[PDB]
């Protein structure tokens, strides 16, 4: 019910089990992508490269 007490609310569960199958990596969660600057000697990374 909506007004449940915290000790017994419908508590969320999100298990992000990192699974190693017989295939290379194809899934990511990159919520960190920053800005980009040009015409300046910097260091850059694009999805692994």
């Amino acid at each position: 019910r909506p007004t449940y007490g915290v000790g017994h609310q419908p508590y969320r569960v999100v298990v992000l089990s990192f699974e190693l199958l017989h295939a290379p990596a194809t899934v990511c969660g990159p919520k960190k992508s920053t800005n980009l600057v040009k015409n300046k000697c910097v260091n850059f990374n694009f999805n692994g490269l």
Binding site: L21, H22, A23, P24, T26
Partner: protein, 98 residues
């Protein structure tokens, strides 16, 4: 159409995926002999890969002379080996008689 003309039961279904109808260059029911669809089905290191090329080839007797590379269409990290394969054809009904 009916899905049971191919199978009867589905068990332990883990992967389903819906995408665009990658049979492009489709035309009327009798638009054959005007286009050629090429597909490559592969399974390497667990990546099942499908490459395709829907080139509207004015066919002669058979596959023509020329070059047309198959651009990649899909890569799936399924990881299952493939040994036996089959081709699925379609049939129209009578539409007049039971």
């Amino acid at each position: 159409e009916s899905e049971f003309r191919v199978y009867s039961s589905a068990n332990n279904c883990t992967f389903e995926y819906v995408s665009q109808p990658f049979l492009m260059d489709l035309e009327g029911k009798q638009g054959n002999f005007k286009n050629l669809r090429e597909f490559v089905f592969k399974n390497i290191d667990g990546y099942f890969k499908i490459y395709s090329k829907h080139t509207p080839i004015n066919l002669g007797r058979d596959l023509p002379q020329g070059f047309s590379a198959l651009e990649p269409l899909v890569d799936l990290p399924i990881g299952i080996n493939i040994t036996r394969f089959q081709t699925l054809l379609a049939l129209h009904r009578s539409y007049l008689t039971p």
